[PDB]
Amino acid sequence: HHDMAGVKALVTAGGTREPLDPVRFIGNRSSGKQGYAVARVLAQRGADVTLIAGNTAGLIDPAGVEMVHIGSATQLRDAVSKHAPDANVLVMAAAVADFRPAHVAAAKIKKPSSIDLVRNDDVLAGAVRARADGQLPNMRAIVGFAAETGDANGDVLFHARAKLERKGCDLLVVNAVDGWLLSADGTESALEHGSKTLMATRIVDSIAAFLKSQ
Amino acid sequence: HHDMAGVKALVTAGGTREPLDPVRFIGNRSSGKQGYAVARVLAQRGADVTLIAGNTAGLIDPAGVEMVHIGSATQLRDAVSKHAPDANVLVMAAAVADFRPAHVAAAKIKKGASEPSSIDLVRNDDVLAGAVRARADGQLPNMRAIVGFAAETVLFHARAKLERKGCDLLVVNAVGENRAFEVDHNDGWLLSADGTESALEHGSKTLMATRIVDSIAAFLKSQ
Ligand SMILES: Nc1ccn([C@@H]2O[C@H](COP(=O)(O)OP(=O)(O)OP(=O)(O)O)[C@@H](O)[C@H]2O)c(=O)n1
Ligand SMILES: Nc1ccn([C@@H]2O[C@H](COP(=O)(O)OP(=O)(O)OP(=O)(O)O)[C@@H](O)[C@H]2O)c(=O)n1
Ligand SMILES: O=C(c1ccc(O)cc1)c1ccc(O)c(O)c1O
Ligand SMILES: O=C(c1ccc(O)cc1)c1ccc(O)c(O)c1O
Ligand SMILES: O=C(c1ccc(O)cc1)c1ccc(O)c(O)c1O
Ligand SMILES: [Ca+2]
Ligand SMILES: [Ca+2]
């Protein structure tokens, strides 16, 4: 059906690239496919979708979705800050680089020893803090994504719960590196494995349930 | 006209990805399209082509070409040295990372409150120079032409890089797609080790690959 009519959705997808010079960057391996799928499913179910996309596995701009393209984490933060006021739902599915090189050259570096790094802003935490300080009165659902693994410091669910708690978002989509939907009300739903489209359907369903209650 | 019939060519294309941990890497913005086009033109003109491809997931495999996929500069080095002894022509079109992180983490590196450590770096082996070295030392008897690529922002550094690497032909500034609003530097050259410089018109990747292969074919029959 069209159970998302009127809802303005802001989605981020793909990995960011943190330049060292015009040709080299620090990047990550995320394809952006899962975020695109959520944007497509949101748009199909009646939402006005803006998709902020970084580096993608040659993906095609989805139909009927406003596209914003970005390169680095800082440009993603600016674009989200730009469009966040008009959004009812923020879906932070982008793999945002946690650091950027301390210096960026305008011309290719030629033939060095060490790259100094500086921390990037947490865009998801910024949206959570802004909504709680009354600056995003239109925002009804903030969704983060996380890939978690168990290790010597804790099982996978322990780490996923700690992330939900630290971020403070309404829903945390957890991929167990299948996974979970962790809500801010404590509910914990297993996310059955399937294609990127099928898992997007379950995510959007979860967003819909959290909106129809609020 | 199969002017490359009976020629076995090994082509490298794409950028390498130097891992920091399982999900992060140092990479570069090379698409690999120019090397794919050289590989395609070689096969279209009769060559038996093996293509060693880096970060090029979005590109179509050229028809008639054997694909070898690699990730890092070190995997490209091992693949070239494995396949070079069977080739007659080596076309080094890959944007090979000059450096790699000195330690690759086993787990995803977690952000802390601590100040970020730097990324310590170490040089990767010069794969093109390793091939030239191996030929000079008698290990590549079948090798008839080693082709390197270079970007220099021009003829001072192009002729200089030519003699530092020691290859047979240097393609300089075969960049761009003649795309709207990309500045045409008029920087393209084909430099031969035998003393020939030819201007590379900055057109499509295909017209450039055609010019590159024309030069390889004229260099081979020169022998
Ligand atoms: N600078 C950042 C980093 C991440 N995120 C968002 O925060 C969520 C969680 O990202 P994750 O990588 O799991 O968490 P971090 O808190 O960055 O921690 P770590 O990498 O140490 O696990 C994702 O939806 C991501 O889009 C963000 O908004 N800004
Ligand atoms: N580790 C490397 C680096 C480069 N190359 C090859 O060398 C040629 C020229 O690369 P170049 O840009 O000259 O790299 P460097 O010699 O390190 O110089 P620069 O600092 O300008 O990049 C290309 O054909 C490339 O495939 C290589 O085989 N192995
Ligand atoms: O944490 C690192 C990192 C630091 C040192 C190292 O040897 C390997 C990785 C990092 C660097 C750049 C970046 O963009 C990023 O997100 C990162 O997490
Ligand atoms: O040239 C650099 C470089 C050096 C210092 C700096 O601040 C930024 C970039 C480089 C770094 C990492 C890498 O993997 C690589 O191949 C490289 O050529
Ligand atoms: O560069 C090469 C190399 C490149 C091409 C070729 O045909 C043969 C060797 C190399 C290979 C292995 C190694 O250990 C090394 O240090 C190296 O420099
Ligand atoms: Ca992170
Ligand atoms: Ca180089």
CA atoms within 13 A on the CB side of B64: 15
- From the CA of A159, give the closest atom in ligand 1: 22
Which helix (H) or strand (E) is B119 found in, with range? strand B119-123
The token pair that represents A93 in the structure block: 């599915």
Residue A24 backbone dihedrals phi, psi, to 5 degrees: -110, 150
Q: How far is CA B194 from CA A116, B137, B173, B217, in A?
A: 44, 20, 20, 14
Contact B119 A114 (CB under 8 A): yes
CA distance B214 to A161: 62
With a 6 A CB cut-off, is B146 part of the ligand 2 pocket? no
CA distance A147 to A177: 6
CA distance B127 to B129: 5
Which helix (H) or strand (E) is B120 found in, with range? strand B119-123
Helix ranges, A55-169 (H): 73-83, 123-132, 156-167
Distance between start and end Cα atoms, chain B: 20
C-beta atoms surrounding A6 within 10 Å: 9
Torsion on CA atoms B52, B53, B54, B60, rounded to nearest 10: -170
List active site positions of A. 28
CA distance A130 to A136: 6
CA distance A206 to A37: 15
The token pair that represents B191 in the structure block: 């430099």
Of A58, A108, A116, the CB nearest to B118: A116
Contacts of B153 in chain A (CB under 8 A): 107-108
What is the resolution in angstroms?
Answer: 2.0
CA distance B93 to B102: 25
With a 6 A CB cut-off, is B84 part of the ligand 5 pocket? yes
Interchain CB contact of B1 with A (< 8 Å): no
Residue A78: CB partners within 8 Å, gap ≥ 6? none
